[PDB]
Amino acid sequence: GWVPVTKLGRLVKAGKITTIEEIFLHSLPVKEFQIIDTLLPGLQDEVMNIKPVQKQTRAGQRTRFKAVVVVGDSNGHVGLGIKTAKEVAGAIRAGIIIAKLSVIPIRRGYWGTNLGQPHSLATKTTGKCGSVTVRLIPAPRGSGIVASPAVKKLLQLAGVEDVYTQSNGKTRTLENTLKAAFVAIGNTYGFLTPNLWAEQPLPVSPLDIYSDEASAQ
């Protein structure tokens, strides 16, 4: 059974919100993974990397396992989750869920002509995490993803078809690199081009339109 806690989990199960684009429209904070499961079911995951960490303790060494995970369709919705437990599978389980929660949108655009269905980026973008800076650059069709196996895979599941990449930093530390690539494609819907200069009336929040149809008991 589901039994949602939170206003948002109720509205979503109760068929009153149909797509996350709304959630992102109003920047609704998401707490329940089942939300992004029903709202976007073609989500397929992918374990990116697994590594042992180790803690020294007042009565034992502690080597648990860190797992990095990417979820996405291939249609403008990515999620990057990082989790460390003491069994591998438990790290992967919890990782997939975290990655579902963080599922963000991708604005993709055209390399430079109007044609049929966006295939690249709106602008260049940059993401930093720790020492690594992943920089994303719009590319012409059939350029492909010009990126390392990991970052490529995050960019495919994200929905991108052709892009250029450049990286700076100790890129061998996978955790930081993917996080930077994540932040890089996360930045695409923060960048103001003139095609988005037009004034919008300012939509009303689902949390208020189905006010009643949410609500605790």
Binding site: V5, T6, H26, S27, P29, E32, D208, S211, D212, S215
Partner: protein, 206 residues
């Protein structure tokens, strides 16, 4: 858009000056406040109650606007506001939080304290900062009672007050409640001093 008779009346004014809701903070004085009015010598800054009144009105005008009146939340960790908030929540919809807050109340569904409102009203963003912080982890607008030395990060619409104690905070909450009911609500007409005593809100004893 101006109502017409929602000007600040001489009866409200008298209420306020007896409450000293105009007696603002001393040397200390946050840059982000032109709610001021001529430096009264020897420390004290006088607070422009007109502006005070309008803010309160706008405050009330946003409180009533929340579909379910009970996911309006009142906060007060300061003792001098606990009797007020309970008395505010009493009359209007509004869920109260008096005393200790308890962190994780807005993030963390898993807690027994868990609220999830559409608006937050707060009495002293110094003492109640736990909540001001918490609410901006999760998109809650905030109304707050602010003196001349109150932080104002993460609080929209300040109501310039006098959290120096006594009757001020009690008054402002009473006036707050009094207006949210005069709004789409269970009240009345013009002057109409309201049945309920303003000393009902007020810290007790000893």
């Amino acid at each position: 858009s101006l109502p017409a008779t929602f000007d600040l009346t001489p009866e409200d004014a008298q209420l306020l000056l007896a409450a000293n809701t105009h007696l603002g903070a001393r040397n200390v004085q946050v840059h982000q406040e032109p709610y001021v009015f001529n430096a009264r010598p020897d420390g004290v800054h006088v607070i422009n109650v007109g502006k005070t009144w309008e803010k309160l009105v706008l405050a009330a005008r946003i409180i009533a606007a929340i579909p379910n009146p009970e996911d309006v939340v009142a906060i007060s960790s300061r003792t001098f506001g606990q009797r007020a908030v309970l008395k505010f929540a009493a009359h209007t919809g509004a869920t109260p939080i008096a005393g200790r807050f308890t962190p994780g109340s807005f993030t963390n569904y898993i807690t027994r304290s868990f609220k999830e409102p559409r608006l937050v009203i707060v009495t002293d963003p110094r003492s109640d900062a736990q909540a001001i912080k918490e609410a901006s982890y999760v998109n809650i607008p905030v109304i707050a009672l602010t003196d001349l030395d109150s932080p104002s990060e993460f609080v929209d619409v300040a109501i310039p007050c006098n959290n120096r104690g006594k009757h001020s905070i009690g008054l402002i909450w009473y006036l707050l409640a009094r207006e949210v009911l005069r709004l789409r609500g269970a009240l009345v007409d013009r002057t109409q001093p309201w049945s309920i005593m303003p000393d009902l809100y007020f810290y007790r004893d000893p």
